[PDB]
Amino acid sequence: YWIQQDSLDFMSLNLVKYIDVGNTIDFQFKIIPKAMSTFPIPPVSMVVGNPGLVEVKTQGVFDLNENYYLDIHVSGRFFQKGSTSIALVLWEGSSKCYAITLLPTIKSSCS
Amino acid sequence: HTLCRVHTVRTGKVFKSNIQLQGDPLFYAFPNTFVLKNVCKADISVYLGQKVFLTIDN
């Protein structure tokens, strides 16, 4: 697998994003499969740590070449602080790739 | 045979035309041969060697 994130400051494997009240964080990833792919189902599985303080909207699209585009939109629920980690895991990918899982951390707080 | 295949170009000799050379032919001072190409018009070139040939054609 190959993970493409062309947006600057989102490229680093570990990243922490801050959300204020009513603010929203949007990002997009592309997955290029160097081989066959599990086409009916998306190649990325994602989980959230304390979904009670973060609402997540995910959109995924396949294309002609089987590349997978996903957009994640992260927003806070209401006025409280805490932190949650959303992990995006290539379940199909082997243990030999340099990057399999991505662990953004979303903080509701003063940046 | 290998690499390139020879062919010779020879025109205007279909009848026994007899035009004698006028003046003294030029010769390139250096032992090695050289071909100087006009950069802009590819067809025009000068062969410098034992005898000097300036060809409008290639």
């Binding site: 009240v21 009513g22 979904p51 009670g52 002609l64 629920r77 209401f78 006025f79 | -």
Partner: protein
Amino acid sequence: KESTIKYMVNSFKGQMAVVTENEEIWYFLEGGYDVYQVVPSQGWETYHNLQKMQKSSFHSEDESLVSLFFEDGKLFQLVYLFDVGKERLVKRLLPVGTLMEYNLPKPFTVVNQGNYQAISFTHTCPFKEIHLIDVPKKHHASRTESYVALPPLVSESLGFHNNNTLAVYQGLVYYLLWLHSKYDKPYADPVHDPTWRWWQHKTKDKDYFFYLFSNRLAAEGIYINMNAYQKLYNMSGDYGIPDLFFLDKGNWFTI
């Protein structure tokens, strides 16, 4: 000519199935002049054995075909399993593409690799792959009107919904469809998108309402979002060639 057909089932989308007295299913694709025996076949034996290995609950050693029918272009057969103790009638699926992919005697040749020879099956499909690009919007092509009604938010820490919250959700969805019905009045109204007349003045108070919810000061902790209940005109969603197409007086499409 030895077999006799008991009945015929059609997909109305280019495929057809045939059931005989011997209880063997044949498949016909309207593109070709070929009928294929799907159920008594090598591929079906392979697929049935795989369903045994996976321990499927729909597959048993002894079963009787009750009937089969097409559901949205998929062949579903309802069958009575004679499992000891847990005998039951259930509707299973017949993936004919999978059955054809597993039919196994196929033209093959012995190719040569690195001082070794291996069995390379000879491809029969004229093309490696087929793709549809520049597809046309499914919802515009099929002329479908689509609404969205997301559930109201709750301030509960664990995020669960009470019965009253579900009642609020129920009433809001009802009112959305009620406006859908009342939009058919003859008079134009000033602004299109009927839900406008529902929100109207309240659209000026959203921040206030949101404030009362963020600090959990708002009534029963429910939050009713204006944008949650609305009719979507243009979205980029599921794609491919739509099933239905509608044409009117010389308008055209491309594939």
